[PDB]
Design a protein around this ligand. Structure first.
Ligand SMILES: CC(C)=CCC/C(C)=C/CC/C(C)=C/CC/C(C)=C/CC/C(C)=C/CC/C(C)=C/CC/C(C)=C/CC/C(C)=C/COP(=O)(O)OP(=O)(O)O
Length: 176
């Protein structure tokens, strides 16, 4: 069965190390996505489209820099895209999702560790299901570089981008 991601209750949150002593946190908004489940209700395929211009870290000048031609170039590349290539059930509600993540013109493999909830009938007719997932990427894999950075050799802006997803997905009534 096909579930559609609800952009209003899906969150993408990320963290990057700053000067080795702290983290900068940010978010991205999802535009759309879906999950297909097999007869057993295990997720088999998942895809999402993310609004690149939505990147937000709570400082407008920094967010401008992130969106600029110097970094994400969100005017030329309005989306970040994820498409799964393999989903492995791990037991219980756990799944490992391998997929391809596109940022600008570069696509690289990423791994998500996901946990899925039991579906509910929501207060408005629809079937609704949630999931949480975690992972990390190295921004340099997408040629997203930063600076002349110097501290001891250390980094102003870390290479690793840790992220957490909270997802809600929906399907029509007992009838699709
Ligand atoms: C059944 C069911 C519901 C199943 C569900 C399945 C499921 C889990 C589906 C999920 C669908 C989705 C949404 C999948 C998404 C997949 C993935 C991997 C998404 C990843 C998104 C992501 C994190 C993209 C990140 C891109 C980047 C490059 C972020 C970069 C952040 C960055 C470098 C920030 C700057 C931070 C540093 C510290 C700046 C310092 O600031 P400052 O000192 O002021 O400097 P300046 O001002 O100069 O900028």
């Amino acid at each position: 069965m096909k579930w559609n991601l609800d952009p209003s209750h899906t969150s993408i949150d990320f963290k990057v190390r700053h000067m080795g002593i702290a983290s900068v946190r940010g978010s991205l908004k999802v535009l759309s996505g879906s999950v297909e489940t097999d007869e057993a209700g295990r997720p088999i395929q998942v895809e999402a489209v993310i609004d690149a211009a939505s990147i937000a870290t709570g400082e407008p000048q920094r967010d401008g820099h992130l969106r600029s031609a110097d970094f994400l170039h969100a005017e030329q590349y309005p989306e970040i895209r994820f498409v799964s290539t393999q989903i492995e059930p791990l037991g219980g509600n756990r799944y490992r999702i391998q997929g391809n993540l596109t940022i600008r013109d570069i696509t690289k493999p990423v791994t998500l560790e996901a946990e899925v909830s039991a579906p509910i009938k929501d207060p408005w007719g629809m079937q609704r299901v949630a999931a949480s997932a975690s992972g990390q990427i190295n921004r340099k894999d997408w040629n997203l570089t930063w600076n002349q950075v110097l501290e001891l050799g250390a980094l102003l802006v870390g290479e690793e981008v840790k992220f957490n997803l909270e997802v809600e997905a929906v399907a029509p009534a007992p009838v699709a």
